[PDB]
DNA sequence: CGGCATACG
DNA sequence: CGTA
DNA sequence: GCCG
């Protein structure tokens, strides 16, 4: 009745299982801290297959036959079932491993590497980072900067806002190109960490040049806080923006991409997410239909061929998916 | 046991 | 290495 | 850590 891929099963952002999920989710992103993938992957699909249930799990039973439950997984579910607490969910919590690998790596331009490399010299804090700046690249300097406005949450409202000054920016870069609304916010999110926009022109080839365009002019326009090229051929962007607040502003991350109108599903689709959702697509493409998947197209490695999709129903219908809607991708 | 998504900056 |  |  529960199928073993997250992409085969509609995941809601908001569900009946929610202090389960959470603590198995702790557990992969402790696992991710030590490189320990494998667990990573399945200490989150076990989470999600809990986010896809109908009704809060309420005794250890309810888990027989769940894919991605075995020993370890359905430990930790009794423990909260019986007890209210896992403890070693709980002492992972409290691990200054975990509190400081999670403090660095939510860091723009610190991943698990670079993280795991500061905690092994002995730093601990932001502050420790930020006595030591000669050890710091461009990137990780602009996150260190900003680090206390990134780490609060934007709302969808002013989500509209930046859109429309995006769009201003794309119109003058090329007449007829579109803004879409891509991440957690298709997802339905009421709030998140970042935006992110896709853009695209209805004539193949026109996109092509198109994001430096962009970038230059909300540059002029004093809006981009931090991005790669200040100092200046590129499709993603992943920049600071200013964002209007009363009487001042914030800080705000915001991914832009470029794709080519005959991309344009795939590429909907991937930066649509989640996360766990596109890894579980890819993998069942691969695995159940000998297929390729990226955000750029599907390949038949047999025939040497990719599929033409004119929309994110096309990609689901080749890949023999009944489709979800953005709303239900939140695996 | 092997496998675990797949790109771009 | 970082980013999504 | 779990699946096939
Ligand atoms: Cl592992
Ligand atoms: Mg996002
Ligand atoms: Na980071
Ligand atoms: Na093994």
Redesign the pocket.
């Given at each position: 009745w529960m199928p073993?891929y997250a992409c085969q099963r509609p995941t809601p952002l908001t569900h009946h299982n929610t202090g389960l999920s959470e603590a198995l989710e702790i557990?992969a992103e402790a696992?991710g801290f030590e490189g320990?993938?494998?667990?990573l992957?399945?200490?989150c699909?076990?989470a999600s297959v809990l986010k896809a249930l109908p009704s809060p799990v309420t005794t250890l039973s309810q888990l027989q036959g769940?894919?991605?439950?075995?020993?370890?997984?359905?430990?930790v579910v009794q423990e909260l079932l019986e007890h209210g607490v896992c403890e070693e969910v709980e002492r992972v919590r409290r691990s200054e491993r975990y509190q400081t690998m999670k403090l660095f790596?939510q860091?723009?331009?610190?991943?698990?590497?670079?993280?795991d490399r500061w905690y092994r010299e002995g730093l601990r804090t932001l502050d420790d980072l930020r006595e030591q700046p000669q050890k710091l690249?461009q990137?990780?300097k602009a996150?260190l900067q900003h680090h206390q406005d990134l780490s609060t949450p934007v709302l969808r409202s002013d989500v509209d806002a930046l859109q429309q000054v995006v769009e201003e920016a794309v119109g003058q870069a090329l007449p007829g190109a579109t803004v879409t609304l891509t991440?957690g916010f298709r997802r339905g999110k009421l709030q998140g960490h970042?935006v992110?926009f896709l853009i695209t022109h209805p004539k193949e080839g026109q996109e092509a040049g198109l994001?430096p365009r962009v970038m230059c002019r909300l540059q002029d326009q004093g809006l981009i806080l931090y991005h790669?090229?200040q100092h200046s051929?590129?499709?993603?962007?992943?920049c600071i923006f200013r964002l209007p607040q009363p009487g001042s502003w914030k800080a705000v991350?915001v991914?832009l991409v470029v794709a080519p109108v005959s991309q344009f599903p795939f590429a909907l689709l991937?930066?649509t997410?989640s996360?766990?959702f596109?890894?579980?697509?890819?993998?069942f493409?691969?695995?159940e239909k000998g297929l390729?998947?990226?955000?750029?197209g599907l390949?038949d490695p047999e025939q040497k061929t990719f599929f033409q999709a004119a929309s994110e129903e096309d990609i689901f219908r080749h890949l023999g998916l009944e489709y979800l809607p953005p709303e239900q991708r939140n695996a």
């Open positions: 073993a557990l696992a320990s993938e494998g667990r992957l399945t200490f699909r076990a769940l894919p991605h439950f075995g020993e370890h997984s359905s430990r790596t860091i723009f331009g610190v991943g698990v590497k670079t993280a690249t990137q990780q996150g991440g970042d992110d994001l790669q090229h051929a590129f499709e993603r962007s992943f991350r991914d991937g930066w997410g996360k766990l596109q890894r579980e697509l890819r993998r493409s691969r695995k390729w998947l990226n955000s750029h390949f």
